[PDB]
Symmetry: C3
Subunit: 473 residues, 3 copies
């Protein structure tokens, strides 16, 4: 006859919003947030409350509490809206994308976005496009590799992977090749990458304090943040202005990208398409690129795992060449290697929901209005949910059909508000890795675990030196 306890009975985080914000001002970031939160779960248990003074905040981990959170997902799930991002759009007179929307406005936008961005039918249309970029990546790498006497190229792949994600995402969204794969990076691509870096750095700085504090504590950080958005929006509008003009004179019969479908359907206003198209263009660069580099590293660290994946990719090489759409079903262990990477290195770190109805999490009453934050780092590294958590084991995802481990894999979220660019990111990662495995051996002397850094998204601190050795002629 176990009694449900009140919200206040919950272990409280030893910290405070004030020390945190002064420290964030001093250090100009919160690079150690994941290790601070991870330690607190190791000390306080699977559930703890954060003292935001007035607002209630619950920190959870464990699929257990994710299932219950999905149960309370209303027809309009809520998320703690990102004030500095909203501040920019309100300033320059822009509409908000799905991520920065809540309530009916979010649902209207999402339902018109899902069929052309997330849906399986859409994935079958852009899969061959993404495949062509992935094919061009390995073929350019092969060209560089064969010019060296040892038939291998040792390098920092990070710059190439970013220019791959920019190229593949541009082709999938707009049906336009930027010429960044296999060539020198452009001023446009480098300034965009840098603008995204500055935007996230300044997001972390203006994030954990009210506009009443950040207006005088960090006035320079606001200008810095808005200048970063000015560059992000310059690049993004250039994209949309090109496709909008092209489609105005000729409505193509064939598939020419995601955004072409949205503009042709005209279910959303030009302003709403512009807003959501901006979220997709900018959003697909830093997010897909970091777990891709981590998969390449983890495979260079685990040659045993790498060779299992290579054998799969080489056997299924023929069918995928004919129908690139087969890559989804034909490569289970490579799909599972991405699940393993997103467990160890979750680039999204948290799943947040301002809960709309009272609920019970870990025998504590969580009232309506509480912001429930699921910590994907602690959830993934938990030894009880994942045996030998530190082991890179893609096999742990194969025979879990009826293991009740449905909520073990949540790096893209859950329900209606789950990541829109989930399917596009997965396709970009699968296909790059498939074509790399077919032609090269990934190697490294850097066996040491990479220190992750929190800069809005969980990114590695250092990029390791990866050797790409040619297999065949």
């Amino acid at each position: 006859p176990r009694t449900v306890l009140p919200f206040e009975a919950m272990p409280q985080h030893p910290g405070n919003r004030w020390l945190r914000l002064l420290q964030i001002w001093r250090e100009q970031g919160y690079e150690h947030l994941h290790l601070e939160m991870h330690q607190t779960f190791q000390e306080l248990g699977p559930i703890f409350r954060y003292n935001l003074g007035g607002p209630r905040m619950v920190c959870v981990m464990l699929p257990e509490d994710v299932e219950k959170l999905q149960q309370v997902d209303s027809l309009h799930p809520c998320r703690m809206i990102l004030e500095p991002w909203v501040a920019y759009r309100q300033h320059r007179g822009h509409k908000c994308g799905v991520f920065l929307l809540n309530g009916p406005e979010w649902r209207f936008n999402r339902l018109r976005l899902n069929p052309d961005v997330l849906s399986p039918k859409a994935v079958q249309r852009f899969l061959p496009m993404v495949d062509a970029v992935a094919r061009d990546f390995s073929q350019a790498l092969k060209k560089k590799v064969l010019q060296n006497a040892r038939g291998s190229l040792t390098l920092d792949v990070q710059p190439s992977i970013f220019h791959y994600t920019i190229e593949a995402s541009n082709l999938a969204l707009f049906g336009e090749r930027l010429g960044l794969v296999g060539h020198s990076p452009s001023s446009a691509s480098l300034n965009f990458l840098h603008a995204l870096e500055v935007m996230f750095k300044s997001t972390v700085q203006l994030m954990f304090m009210p506009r009443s504090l950040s207006r005088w504590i960090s006035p320079k950080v606001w200008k810095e943040h808005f200048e970063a958005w000015d560059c992000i929006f310059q690049y993004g509008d250039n994209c949309i202005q090109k496709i909008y003009q092209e489609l105005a004179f000729n409505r193509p019969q064939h598939y020419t990208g995601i955004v072409a479908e949205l503009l042709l359907k005209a279910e959303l206003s030009l302003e709403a398409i512009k807003a959501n198209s901006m979220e997709l263009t900018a959003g697909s660069v830093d997010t897909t690129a970091f777990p891709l580099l981590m998969t390449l590293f983890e495979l260079a660290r685990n040659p045993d795992v790498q060779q299992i994946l290579r054998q799969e990719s080489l056997a299924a090489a023929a069918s995928i060449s004919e129908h690139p759409q087969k890559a989804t079903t034909e490569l289970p262990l490579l799909r599972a290697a991405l699940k393993e990477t997103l467990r160890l290195y979750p680039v999204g770190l948290f799943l947040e929901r301002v809960v709309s109805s009272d609920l019970v999490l870990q025998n504590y009453h969580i009232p309506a209005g509480t912001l429930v934050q699921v910590f994907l780092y602690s959830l993934g590294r938990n030894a009880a949910l994942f045996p030998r958590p530190e082991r890179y084991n893609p096999q742990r995802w194969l025979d879990i059909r009826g293991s009740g481990r449905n909520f073990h894999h949540v790096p893209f979220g859950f329900g209606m508000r789950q990541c829109l660019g989930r399917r596009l990111a997965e396709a970009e990662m699968l296909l790059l890795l498939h074509h790399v495995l077919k032609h090269f051996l990934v190697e490294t002397l850097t066996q040491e675990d990479i220190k992750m850094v929190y800069s809005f998204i969980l990114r590695p601190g250092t990029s390791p030196l990866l050797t790409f050795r040619a297999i065949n002629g």
Copy 2:
């Protein structure tokens, strides 16, 4: 009966208020719209208060006819003091634009056979054609890599690198590798140097050296630093061809400047001066009406398709004989006449008249500067029916002096024929492979910065024809 010079409507402006506005705004970007409004208010003729020197402003072709008859064996122009100041300073000879009297005529008569003449045009036409061919080829390559089989972009950077490439090949017989590749540091710094020099020319153009030396001392340094980059690029070209020709005198045609150096009718210093005037002079002037033709064809698809049909039928004869492009493409030649009617890069035709004359029944004395305004002339509804209508056919239906964007007589633009060939051939190869399109259906705001240039470059879609 005959009205005095003073009886003329006078411009409401001031020789000082304009001088201070140029000081404050660092340019006179709206000069064309200011002059156009004044003709709409004061009539076809008005005088400008220069506070001593006489200045007349005209806009009629009957006055353009009166001005050519009073042109001497040595036509006179108001010499550009800041440009002359730089050449005096660094010890350079003056090119045909900055010369007057016998020195101009000696230089011009040795320049015309190799630069302007029809026989010269037949020699560099195949050279220019190769660059134009390489432009569309590179554009096609970029276009075909996109899913919609089209490339929407700001063409302005490409068109400038085309004019630099085509002009370099025509003058020096040297490919710079700017067409279909990434712009070089040399080309970008040259383009920028030209923009500054043009900007700083306007800033010192309307005030005497006596005022501009203490009012705008930084603008003089800025202007001379700009010329230092322009002359650095130009001399590099000259010292390459001069060394190449010193060891081997080629049998075949290897450019305009090669002919001038081989003939040796003009001193090395005179060739250097005029060669500088051709290299620098061909980059911006040709590029602006080319972009305007591309835009005007993207807003007039009806006109564009008429030109395309002409270019596609005459495609074969121009492929075997590029020199046939001149006679085989009349409508496309007339479309350029139409770009220059509405968008005159030269804006004005100036002459310091040598003898008294009577323009619009007003006495214009000798020594009076006569300034023809090409913007207003081309926008006169009586001379050009529906003047704000891109109708290249209006140059075919003809039943004289209506087309003067390059000037008239002996002093007419020395680059007229090379510029025409560069425009005519780029457009021919673009029409054969692409459809030019734009949602920007609004007239571009033109900017005066010594030459009439567009303020904004529109977004042009180049759709592959098949």
Copy 3:
């Protein structure tokens, strides 16, 4: 009757006036002309007032022959204090140039078989040849696009990117893609780092650590920042090959450094140190006499055509077997000897003598620094008739040719530099005529190495 050390003519200038001009002018650009004048006015031998330490300046090959006879098992060099200072600071081992005694001999004998030896030269010769072939091929492409079938340019940037490419391929078996393409940020920053290091070497060289600490404190930072860039580029090179070889030991030849790492006769730290000396050392040194050969051939068309006829006849055998380039081209090898006679990159040969010796009938005691001046030596009218004449034939008609030094301590990159020069020149002569109106001698500038002040405008005219 042998005279004492003190009886020798003394250099007129004091060490302090020289030290103050190096402070003021931020270099010693006229050193070669100052030393040349002193040999002209004093004789073939003169001592330098170091205010205690003994220093002898020689210019005759008869004296080189003698300086060699005392060399000993471990020849001693006047160690370059600012270079050693950087290594000691960042915790690096010293390369064979900055080493002395047994440590130098241990390093040298493990380096000679894979860097200097004839068997090694036969292994990297085809590699270097491929880069030289790519250079002329790229130049031909640019040349043929011009109406006069010629390209007039400043070759200096291309020659430097050739030496960087060829040396990288020979040492690491890696193509950087610098030949026939646009220069990279890595290559430009490296070139600039080497320039700043050689300039700040001269600035800190002629004064001790004590004076340079307060006279030129900014110059030390400048010098160490330059080395930081040189070492960044060099470690990137070695980190790549070390990782590649760790997973696969290649059966075929994949460069000089691959052999050193596979043999593992030297410690990783010693390989790192010597590999740094080879990577950085092969850029400026080889590039300056190469540009000087191209210039001297553009002013001597008569000599150029003699070399062209040789290169065109021997074109077939060198195409099949590139390793034949060494023996098949005697006049072209002699043209390099001729360029290094007039324009010696490494102006001096220095030795701190371990035993007493006699030079020009003067007693030179043990401990004495003996500096051979290669500029005056190669400009002596008695050893070389009509010395100003660029005549490679003189080398065909006994210590006369010593631009790489002598004995055990002679230039390690001597045979790699020769191969890089010979082959580039062979492929240029085959396809182009080198021409110039600049018929005036280039003013040389001492910047640790003897480099030209100005790069002339050279026309490369296609033959067919």
